């Protein structure tokens, strides 16, 4: 596929894996961040030589923000093999999920702005600012069958749910038949934790495409403690309100129920009471396991009923 070597702290590893896969990479190797980073190469020189020459690794991904000197030196070595740091990784995730011209322009504006300090540390500078100025110009100027979008935080199992329904391009829109009805399933970008300031506008503009969909499926990790559940739901419904989602039916799926080892009904009833406190209209709240294929027919049937309600 696209294979990545990923450098990440233990604290972020789980999260960064799910991010790398949202950027359509397979993680084929994982290393901690270097204790004592290399002034030139950030990662160790011998490691960089191995990755340089390993035709099974297409891309180096470092879950941190790299200095311009690191980019210059890494890109030199890799010789056409790609390096993403954390900002460029998330811009890649956005680029793969964005279908609108406005989002595409914000992503490109961010990527241009991020290259500037790299070029400055290396006329080209002038070429880049003219494009940056043009896009900013055009952005300030633009400012003046049923579709169900899948939303939720990273690692909640949005891709697992989509794959499971589809039986599986960018952006990912995939029509499926349920009974006698055709339904368009839309992979929206996730809610993302810890978004670097530089890319917040590209993030929100990409996410705000969720308002194109007739209805939404909101995916929530059931393994979360009760107070983490409350917070996740408060923040999901916070964000949806602020991007201008209003009156769209929302089907909430409490996922990963297989991994709960614990009280599913109390979790379910908490999620249901709270989601209905925070938002209207809630279509329904159901428990599933997208991995273990638990309650998939329930999910199926509820997507069909919701599609019947929309039509
Ligand atoms: N145990 C369990 N794991 C799941 C389930 N759904 C997804 N996952 C896993 O959790 C991680 C996040 O899943 P993914 O579908 O990519 O989440 P996303 O970042 O929101 O798209 C992946 O390792 C999935 O295999 C589930 O129902 N149960
Ligand atoms: Mg995913």
UniProtKB/Swiss-Prot annotation:
Assigned keywords, A-Z: Cytoplasm, GTP-binding, Magnesium, Metal-binding, Nucleotide-binding
PROSITE patterns: G_HFLX
Documented activity regulation: GTPase activity is stimulated by the presence of 50S ribosomal subunits. Hydrolysis is probably regulated by the HflX N-terminal domain.
Chain residues that bind GTP: 152-159, 187-190, 255-258, 289-291
Record's keyword annotation contains Acetylation: no
Any one cellular-component term (Gene Ontology): cytoplasm
Localization of this protein: Cytoplasm
Signal sequence residues: none
GO MF annotation terms: GTP binding; GTPase activity; metal ion binding; ribosome binding
UniProt domain Hflx-type G: residue ranges: 146-311
Cofactor: Mg(2+)
Keyword Transmembrane included in the entry's annotation: no
Binding-site positions, Mg(2+): 159
Effect after changing residue 155 to P: Loss of GTPase activity
CDD domains xref list: HflX
Major subcellular site: cytoplasm
PANTHER family per the UniProt record, alphabetical: GTP-BINDING PROTEIN HFLX, GTPASE HFLX
Function (record text): GTPase that associates with the 50S ribosomal subunit and may have a role during protein synthesis or ribosome biogenesis. Specific for GTP.
Protein family: Belongs to the TRAFAC class OBG-HflX-like GTPase superfamily. HflX GTPase family.
NCBIfam families: GTP_HflX, small_GTP
Subunit structure: Monomer. Associates with the 50S ribosomal subunit. Does not associate with 70S ribosomes.
Name of this protein: GTPase HflX
Organism of provenance: Saccharolobus solfataricus (strain ATCC 35092 / DSM 1617 / JCM 11322 / P2) (Sulfolobus solfataricus)
Lineage per the UniProt record: Archaea, Thermoproteota, Thermoprotei, Sulfolobales, Sulfolobaceae
């Amino acid at each position: 596929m696209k294979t990545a070597a990923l450098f990440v702290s233990k604290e972020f590893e789980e999260e960064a894996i799910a991010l790398v896969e949202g950027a359509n990479y397979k993680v084929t190797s994982i290393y901690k961040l270097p204790k004592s980073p290399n002034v030139k190469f950030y990662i160790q020189y011998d490691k960089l030589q191995q990755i340089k020459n390993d035709e099974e690794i297409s891309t180096l991904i470092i879950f941190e923000q790299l200095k311009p000197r690191h980019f210059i030196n890494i890109r030199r070595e890799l010789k056409g093999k790609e390096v993403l740091d954390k900002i460029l990784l998330l811009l890649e995730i956005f680029a793969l999920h964005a279908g609108s011209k406005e989002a595409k322009m914000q992503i490109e504006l961010a990527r241009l702005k991020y290259e500037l300090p790299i070029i400055k540390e290396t006329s080209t500078i002038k070429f880049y600012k003219r494009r940056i100025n043009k896009l900013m110009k055009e952005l300030e100027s633009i400012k003046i069958i049923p579709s169900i979008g899948i939303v939720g935080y990273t690692n909640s199992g949005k891709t697992s749910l989509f794959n499971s329904l589809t039986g599986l391009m960018s952006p990912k829109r995939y029509a499926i038949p349920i009974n006698n009805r055709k339904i368009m399933l839309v992979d929206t970008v996730g809610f993302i934790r810890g978004i670097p300031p530089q890319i917040v506008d590209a993030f929100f503009v990409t996410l705000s495409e969720a308002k194109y969909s007739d209805a939404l499926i909101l995916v929530i990790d059931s393994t979360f403690s009760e107070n983490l559940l409350i917070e996740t739901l408060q923040s999901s419904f916070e964000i949806l309100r602020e991007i201008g989602v209003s009156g769209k039916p929302i089907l909430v799926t409490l996922n990963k129920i297989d991994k709960i080892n614990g009280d599913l009904y109390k979790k379910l009833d908490l999620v249901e009471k709270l989601s209905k406190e925070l938002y209207s209209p809630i279509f329904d709240v159901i428990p599933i396991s997208a991995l273990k294929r638990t309650n998939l027919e329930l999910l199926r049937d509820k997507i069909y009923q919701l599609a019947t309600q929309l039509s």
